[PDB]
Amino acid sequence: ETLLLRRKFFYSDQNVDSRDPVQLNLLYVQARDDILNGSHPVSFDKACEFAGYQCQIQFGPHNEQKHKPGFLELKDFLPKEYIKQKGERKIFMAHKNCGNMSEIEAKVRYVKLARSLKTYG
Numbered sequence: 001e002t003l004l005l006r007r008k009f010f011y012s013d014q015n016v017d018s019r020d021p022v023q024l025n026l027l028y029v030q031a032r033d034d035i036l037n038g039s040h041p042v043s044f045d046k047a048c049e050f051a052g053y054q055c056q057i058q059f060g061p062h063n064e065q066k067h068k069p070g071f072l073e074l075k076d077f078l079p080k081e082y083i084k085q086k087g088e089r090k091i092f093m094a095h096k097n098c099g100n101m102s103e104i105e106a107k108v109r110y111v112k113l114a115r116s117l118k119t120y121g
Contacts, residue, residue, distance in 0.1 A: 013112050013115070018108055021104060021107070024104075024107055024108060024111055025107065027111040027114070027115075028057075028107045028110050028111055028114075030114075031050070031110060031111055031113075031114030031115075032050065032054065032110075032114075034114065035047055035050060035078070035079055035114075036076075036077075036078075036079055037079075038079040038080060038081060040114075040117055040118055041081075042114075042117045043117070044082070044085070044087060044090070045090075046113065046117060047078060047079070047082060048087060048090045048091055048093070048094050049094045049097075049113065050110065050113065050114070051072070051074065051077050051078055051091045051094065052091045052092070052093070052094025052095045052097070052098060053094065053098060053106045053107075053109075053110055054077060055067065055072055055077075055091070055095065056095060056098050056101070056103070056106055057103050057106045057107050057110070060103060061095070061098060061099060061100040061101065062100075067095075069088050069089065069091045069092035069095070070088060072088070072091060074086060074087065074088055074091065
């Protein structure tokens with residue numbers, strides 16, 4: 001009848017790059033641009049994260065009264081598809097999750113994240 005079998009359970013991001021922040025920054029930037037470009041229809045929630053993190057990685061979680069979800073440039077941060085929706089209150093939410101994560105630790109996940117949306121199949 002049939003003699004086949006499918007199975008694939010493994011996920012080990014790049015470590016030879018993770019270490020190097022340069023290659024991580026190059027990816028982080030591209031990842032962001034990719035979003036701004038509007039080529040990868042990432043989940044609103046996801047894209048939200050990136051933004052929230054961007055601000056974080058941008059300045060840092062070492063703020064609250066100054067760092068506002070408005071001051072941000074969702075227009076120069078999120079793609080039109082989002083601009084229209086104007087998901088601000090959403091951004092903040094992400095930050096809440098981030099909390100006070102390292103600027104690098106955030107950048108790392110960022111690349112991975114952007115590397116999570118684009119799946120192969």
